[PDB]
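During the second half of the funding period, the structural biology subgroup turned its attention to how the target accommodates small molecules. The most pressing case was ytterbium (III) ion, which had performed well in the primary screen but for which no bound structure existed. We therefore specified the complex as follows and requested a full 3D prediction, including the ligand pose.
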Amino acid sequence: VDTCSLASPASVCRTKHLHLRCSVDFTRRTLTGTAALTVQSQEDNLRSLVLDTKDLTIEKVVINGQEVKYALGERQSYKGSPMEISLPIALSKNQEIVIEISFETSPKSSALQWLTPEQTSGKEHPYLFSQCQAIHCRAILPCQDTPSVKLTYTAEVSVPKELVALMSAIRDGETPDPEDPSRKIYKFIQKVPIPCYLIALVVGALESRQIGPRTLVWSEKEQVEKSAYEFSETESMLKIAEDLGGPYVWGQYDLLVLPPSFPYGGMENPCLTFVTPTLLAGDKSLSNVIAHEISHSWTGNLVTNKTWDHFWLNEGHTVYLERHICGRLFGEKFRHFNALGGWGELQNSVKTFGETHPFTKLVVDLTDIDPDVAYSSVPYEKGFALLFYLEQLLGGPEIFLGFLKAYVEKFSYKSITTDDWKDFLYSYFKDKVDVLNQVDWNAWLYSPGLPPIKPNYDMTLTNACIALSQRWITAKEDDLNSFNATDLKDLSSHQLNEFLAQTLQRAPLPLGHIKRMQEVYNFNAINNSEIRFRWLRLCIQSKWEDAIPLALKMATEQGRMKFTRPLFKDLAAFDKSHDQAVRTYQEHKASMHPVTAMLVGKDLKVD
Ligand SMILES: c1ccc(NCc2cccnc2)cc1
Ligand SMILES: [Yb+3]
Ligand SMILES: [Yb+3]
Ligand SMILES: [Zn+2]
């Protein structure tokens, strides 16, 4: 049971293919067109089926060339409204028909952000981008909006002729629009079956540059050069990923660098990974996000979670592969450093939610919970921790990577649950079952809080970060003079970030300490988004008023929720900035990404 979807389940009927024919109307902020769903009955005598929708206007539903009866049910909050369709002829098991639905989206579609020209780099053209994960596809088109169903797709998208459309699919040409010469039609094919949350569309003034044998980077013109350099490791990471996961099946691996309001670090849309421009640090230091998106091409896109309760399957294995890629590139000591950092992020998450909170469980129960509200680092880092623990238990990385590859092969093109994974783990490691039986599965999978066992981590690269953080925390006023820019001499950006993460865990620090830190380290000058985020959080939590404008600026000039949400929350918790934070949210809300707007509003208790 997919408790996030109102559609007929996969046991009743299954969408095999979507052909989408649509037009992007920037004047009305609507996508209008037809979704032709090829649906296969899984039941005898099937006479109706139900699809998910959210804020969609339905013109008509056509089957066999005639209009048929349908009904939209009452809205169920974030789940949208179920659409029941009356089939004109009862279907036998395995019979396939095509259902063509004429529809239009709402300007407030939670799947979409529509940007005015001033919100773009070039300032002349508007821009549209989608983000379907987890349950926002239903806000673009009527569908069985559950990852338990996998479908291929084709699309034809009409857009103003000065603009470019791209999708999570292979580009299949472009022509002028016969119905409107001011327009172009872009065509796309996705021949590998995918869950619908992987459907993606961008439309804007896009340019491309080739950066590897199977990768173009796409962005507005003013970000092309910087992005090509930032992501130049992409082909080397793809090759490593193929070694660990098996054949890359998707053809192209292109990158799209979004405008700053893109709500996540990356989204693994097949053939076209979407990324935040906050990755553009200038030195490739945030490239683990690319490694992560690349890894989803196996873990998530090939082997997929059956429902969102099992999201950790997607994220945990992906983080596990991510960290192996970075380990191969930069060394095993670096894989351990990143692993240990992740455990720190997990500590933060558990502390934030509370150690007994149900969202700190690995396998969650999303009944009546908006997946956007449950989203956190828990499935990423608790999932990774479980896999890293099992790696250590079962004899090391070489051995566990053998399992990972077998797992991907076994479940490729399928949707699976935690029990399917666990079952295969036991099958694969049958000669080590006594070891597996020592695992507290009930705790790891189903209990809240930190895991019952902490893995072993090499400390080599972490030691200097902890040592320096501890010097600062234990410093008294008469110690402040001893700090100097030479303290940072031998620290990488990764280590500077970890030093701040360690210190942030003990925040607040005395205001004089934080002022001295700026005096000697000049963290205000660092534009690396990860570093700047943690530094500004440390400043605001330590009540430094000078930091207020910097934090407000970062919170609003980009919209990656990882940064914008905690920055707004910290600004709201500081009495001196509370009123400004609320005001600033209120002023920006109408032009924010709709999901970001919703969550920041909840965080601020505004509305
Ligand atoms: C993107 C947006 C929301 C979700 N939510 C599903 C989820 C969250 C946390 C734990 N378990 C499952 C997933 C991806
Ligand atoms: Yb039934
Ligand atoms: Yb002293
Ligand atoms: Zn992910």
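Two results from this model are relevant to the next phase. The pocket of zinc ion (ligand 4) is lined by residues 292, 296, 315, 318 (CB under 6 Å). Residues 302-458 form a domain with the Neutral Protease; domain 2 fold (CATH 1.10.390.10).
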